[PDB]
A paper describes a structure:
Multidrug resistance protein 1 ([name]) is an ATP-binding cassette ([name]) transporter that harnesses the energy of ATP to extrude substrates from the cytosol to the extracellular space. [name] is a single polypeptide comprising three transmembrane domains (TMD0, TMD1, and TMD2) and two cytosolic nucleotide-binding domains (NBD1 and NBD2).
Guided by the smFRET results, we then used cryo-EM to capture the most abundant structural configuration of wild-type (WT) [name] during active turnover. On ice, we expect a slower turnover rate and thus even less depletion of ATP. This approximates an ‘active turnover’ condition where ATP hydrolysis has reached steady state. Consistent with the single-molecule data, the resulting map shows an NBD-dimerized conformation, with an ATP molecule in the degenerate site and an ADP molecule in the consensus site. To improve the resolution of the structure, we also carried out 3D classification and obtained a higher quality map at 3.2 Å from a subset of the particles, which unambiguously shows an ADP molecule at the consensus site. Other than ADP occupying the consensus site in place of ATP, the overall structure of this post-hydrolysis conformation is essentially identical to that of the pre-hydrolytic structure solved with the hydrolysis-deficient E1454Q mutant (Johnson and Chen, 2018). In both structures, the intracellular gate is closed and the substrate-binding site is pulled apart such that LTC4 is no longer bound. Thus, for [name], ATP hydrolysis per se and the subsequent release of inorganic phosphate (Pi) do not induce conformational rearrangements.
Residue numbers in the entry: 203 to 268, 311 to 635, 641 to 870, 942 to 1530
Amino acid sequence: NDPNPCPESSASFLSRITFWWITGMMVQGYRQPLESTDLWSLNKEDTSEQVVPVLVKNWKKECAKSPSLFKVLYKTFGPYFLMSFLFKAVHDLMMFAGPEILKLLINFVNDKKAPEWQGYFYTALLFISACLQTLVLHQYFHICFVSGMRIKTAVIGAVYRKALVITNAARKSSTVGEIVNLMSVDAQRFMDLATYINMIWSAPLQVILALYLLWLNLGPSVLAGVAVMVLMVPLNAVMAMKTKTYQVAHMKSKDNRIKLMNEILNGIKVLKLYAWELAFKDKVLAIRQEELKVLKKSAYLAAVGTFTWVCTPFLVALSTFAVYVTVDENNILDAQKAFVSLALFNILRFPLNILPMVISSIVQASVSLKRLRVFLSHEDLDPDSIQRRPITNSITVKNATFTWARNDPPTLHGITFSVPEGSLVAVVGQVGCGKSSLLSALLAEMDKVEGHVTVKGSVAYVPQQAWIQNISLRENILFGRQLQERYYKAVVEACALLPDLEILPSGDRTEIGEKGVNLSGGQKQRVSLARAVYCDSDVYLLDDPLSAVDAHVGKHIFENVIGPKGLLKNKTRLLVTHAISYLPQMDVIIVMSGGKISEMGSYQELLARDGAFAEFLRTYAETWKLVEADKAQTGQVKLSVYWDYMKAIGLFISFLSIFLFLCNHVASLVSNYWLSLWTDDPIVNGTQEHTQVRLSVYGALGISQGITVFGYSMAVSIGGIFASRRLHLDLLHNVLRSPISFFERTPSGNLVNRFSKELDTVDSMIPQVIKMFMGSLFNVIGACIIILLATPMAAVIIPPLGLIYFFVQRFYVASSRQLKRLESVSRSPVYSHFNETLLGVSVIRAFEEQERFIRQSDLKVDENQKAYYPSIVANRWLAVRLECVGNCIVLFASLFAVISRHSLSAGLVGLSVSYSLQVTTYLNWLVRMSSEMETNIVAVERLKEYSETEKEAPWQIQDMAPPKDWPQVGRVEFRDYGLRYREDLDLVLKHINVTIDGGEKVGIVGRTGAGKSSLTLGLFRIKESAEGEIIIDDINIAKIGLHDLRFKITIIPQDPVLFSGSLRMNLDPFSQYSDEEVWTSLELAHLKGFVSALPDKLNHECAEGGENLSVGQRQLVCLARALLRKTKILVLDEATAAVDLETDDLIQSTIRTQFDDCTVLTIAHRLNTIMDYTRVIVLDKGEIQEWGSPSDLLQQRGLFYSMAKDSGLV
Ligand SMILES: Nc1ncnc2c1ncn2[C@@H]1O[C@H](COP(=O)(O)OP(=O)(O)OP(=O)(O)O)[C@@H](O)[C@H]1O
Ligand SMILES: CC(C)CCC[C@@H](C)[C@H]1CC[C@H]2[C@@H]3CC=C4C[C@@H](O)CC[C@]4(C)[C@H]3CC[C@]12C
Ligand SMILES: CC(C)CCC[C@@H](C)[C@H]1CC[C@H]2[C@@H]3CC=C4C[C@@H](O)CC[C@]4(C)[C@H]3CC[C@]12C
Ligand SMILES: CC(C)CCC[C@@H](C)[C@H]1CC[C@H]2[C@@H]3CC=C4C[C@@H](O)CC[C@]4(C)[C@H]3CC[C@]12C
Ligand SMILES: Nc1ncnc2c1ncn2[C@@H]1O[C@H](COP(=O)(O)OP(=O)(O)O)[C@@H](O)[C@H]1O
Ligand SMILES: [Mg+2]
Ligand SMILES: [Mg+2]
């Protein structure tokens, strides 16, 4: 029992054949524009739940049986798609039958004596044949399009189901670029094959059936015609083989582009802060140029392919007629037969003119078939590698050796330990020694070479990089679980989240943002912890959850949650710690260096050892929503869009294209009438050579027609490339120029959609639609001009026939357009969900929530399909209506000719029928193509949207540009400075007033969520000042072009962000300076040893956004990045967060030596590294509290004293 079910199920037989059931929606759509709400629920068999499981099953049955073939696996959609063959057969015989009846009528009308009754019968038999072919043809087309739709669901369903199981090593090879490409473009390639796959036999049948009529007419002279056509195949064959290589290279360039764009949109804040977006712009363009260069070559071959097929029947015709006179000198010599022979030849263009699109589709689909087959055949991480015994030690690892990649050398070298039930274990060691690795090994994320691993009970995971969903804070803490009011409140207060829940705008239920961009580092880490704690599992793997928060909250969380008095007192919990404060509280602590456990034991036991760790210890010891969903445009498409696409093509090509179209269709009409005038001439003994004279002229025009067709097919293709190139550059510049607030609002999939699918539409579709539209347009003008001039008194018939076609076209398109918008809008969540999942697969797999996320994906794809399905039915609805109107007019033209056979104008009236069918079929084509054009241009409308938006301040002002040596003394002055993140939200900073003098070392201290990171975000002018101003050395900041600002001051941001490419590229993407400078920087960064010992020294492939190396190494890469610029104002935003105590001591000593003369302000939680500084700023919520020298603030016994006492400096 559905609330709004599809009417197709309940529809009677008469309704189903004519598609009468969609009538109701089409009328509703005309009155007021269609909404997402009044779309019908899908049919049970059109649903991911019913479609995808049978495909993945067949893959399990077929892949397990084996190489693994994907083509044999596409017998899943075979059964349903066979009926299509039967429907296509009947239609072709009815197409063949049509002309026969028309000959008998055109003959009947001529013969005066013929009985009254026999005339009507022919017209009645014509009308019925036209109706039957229409109904049968559109049953065929509906089966083809429904098949295509079901293949789209399954391809997306399978790819998502696979993405959650694939190995890490395979995840590096199959990048996010390929996965997004597979779900988007390759599914559209299979959908487009679904139509034309049925022509592979329908064209040869039609070619044979037309050829046999010539044998019946001519005889054994039709062989030459077959000999010419068979010789043709090899050319199209080798050219198709050549294209197959171009399509592969084109797709590879498209994957690389989408992969790079993903890495840009991930870390856009870092691009904005370092002022790097021009470097990454140039890189995206370089990849686009390669992709477009190949697409041009593919288009050149298509033109040669089209050129070959269009001029085949004329070359066949001349080849055939030569055979007669070169042997048959005895019997045959006819004059009129030529006309019937040419009338039989001129049908052999209708099959051959649709062939190069069949070839293009099959090649394009065959590439996509290989790419999907290669992706679904990747090695799957096996969960039976770990024992996972039912709820005697908690976890046991015995001589286990794990490796990130199968062929690479192992990370963990023969580790051996056992942890008892309800034991608090700690993991310690150097930066990049394999701690996060050890936790990954127990989750079966890493491949193991040898050993034995047993993990008894359910596992809960807290990763080092916090992963938060787009949904409300409560729903993040729940993570798809039933709510317990007692326990929920008990977890939230234990995780120290109450003050954070107070400061948030709408308290608990706030739209948290796409990657938790709203929250601060500590808030993200606390939510991530709270989720895992709420889940209530047997074993707890905590990857440094007390890093980002200060000493106060850290202690609170340790006493209330993790420690032996908290919630998790009884559960086995293995935490990775860098702090040495809580090691006496631990049961056993495991030290590891270079992937080997150096020594295990308790605090006292390890102290008694007098080892390396002992020596280490001595030295240091109604709710407000944020994300706005995509919303469809309401009215008609504005001429601005069309004019913008045409402006990109250029004036020269547009005047050439139209000119060649005219030359083509003029030659078409000259040939048309020159033949029809040649027809009605007597066969006298004279005009013996005239036939051999004029058939050369017919051949010449046939070649001329072919040459021009090749011409305009080329002209439109190059036009399309110019447009597609220009549109991408405008889109990319518009995106890179927008402010940070826009990116925090707009969903990720919202942009991925426009950069992948909407651009792929602009690249491929629109040129083909333009070619077919212009073709149909000039065909209609060409028919109209002929009938009018042949019968000047037929000027009355044209308007009425046009007006009724126009009103059907204007009615239909109004709804058709809106359905294409709804579909195009509703596909954005599908990308967002894919993007959200791929980041947090480790977490999803740890909590075993796969089924829920898989089930969520199915429900998100259903919405896209619910929007798509009415669109294709509406196409069928229109087509049947227009053809049935066409049949009616043909009947009246046909019936009028029989009624008034001999009354008057007997010679003229007989022909009236002949072109009454022509004009009908051409006006039928014009409406359908004009609609297809209006629905396709929506893609360009969608790309334009980010032109009329909010833009960031001008990059280069070039008038008020400050001197080359502007930051000469780092004198930073804040004057009544106040920041506000949104327009409606309350102020984060207010009435800030400090004077940081030149070369002054300034600390910034405060409680988590005090406005520390926001102050540094404010200085770079990422968010524009609400009140007051900042001044850097007697020069106002708001005035200057922010690229003159941003190059002169450096920051180490809180989150370390690396981009996909060589390790050298991350340090310097402009390629400005030498390798000696990079090496001396990596020497000061303390990565020299690590980066030197690597297989490729500085050409190491950092992939997936720097997942190839550890968090603490990304910290040092971001340090090196800052060390290379060597500016006079430096800003540290917790640069020493996820590192050792030893490693921290080093990079501090670096900062003291290198940045000795330049102004440095540092934000920090480790107060150890502040007490050395000259002055310190302390701020609580939005205002600066007591500030001065650290020694002074300790004497005062105020706030800074309280924070020092927690750290244990006092
Ligand atoms: N997914 C991965 N693919 C390939 N190599 C990896 C991967 N993860 C880690 N490594 C390599 O293993 C080394 C150390 O592993 P790991 O990241 O577990 O260190 P860690 O102890 O977590 O360090 P940190 O203290 O920075 O958290 C790194 O130097 C890195 O090159
Ligand atoms: C005689 C005519 C009318 C019918 C035969 C012509 C067509 C259907 C034939 C001739 C050459 C053939 C192509 C030759 C090469 C390729 C590339 C391959 O990777 C996929 C199949 C594909 C694309 C073939 C499909 C069928 C094909 C296009
Ligand atoms: C170089 C050549 C091919 C460029 C040709 C550009 C042509 C095809 C463009 C420019 C303006 C466009 C038209 C603008 C207005 C409408 C009305 C709409 O209800 C149907 C589409 C239709 C009829 C468009 C069809 C495509 C169009 C005619
Ligand atoms: C109609 C008959 C008489 C003449 C036909 C000549 C045709 C085939 C010629 C004349 C001018 C030519 C065009 C001139 C300019 C360009 C731009 C170039 O970057 C790609 C090829 C392209 C698009 C050419 C394609 C072929 C072309 C259209
Ligand atoms: N992009 C944002 N949009 C709206 N509010 C934000 C944003 N970033 C941070 N906030 C809010 O401002 C407060 C202070 O943030 P911030 O100064 O960045 O944290 P911290 O001082 O801990 O580094 C936080 O409690 C947070 O809720
Ligand atoms: Mg780690
Ligand atoms: Mg911060």
